[PDB]
């Protein structure tokens, strides 16, 4: 790795996020606000994604 190297040979930092979705209890989550829960009424729900 030298600064004069061609772009194809320039260093690149790589991060690979691996995550199984909607399978088991989840701990990591995105930015959202948990609202109240309503029973016996038809609702558009979103539980943990």
């Amino acid at each position: 790795f030298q600064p004069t190297n061609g772009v194809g040979y320039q260093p690149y930092r790589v991060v690979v996020l691996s995550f199984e979705l909607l399978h088991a209890p989840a701990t990591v989550c995105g930015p959202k606000k948990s609202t109240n829960l309503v029973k016996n009424k038809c609702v558009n729900f979103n539980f943990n994604g």
Binding site: L21, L22, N46, G49
Partner: protein, 49 residues
Amino acid sequence: SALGKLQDVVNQNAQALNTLVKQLSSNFGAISSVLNDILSRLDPPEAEV
């Protein structure tokens, strides 16, 4: 068993319906057999596929 011919008919119909319901559990090559999961995980560009 005397009325098997009738029972058969009933049974046959049931099987048909049952299989149809279970056919909802197949991916058919998609990434998930659940429409809600695909809609929750992908944007329209690939959710359409």
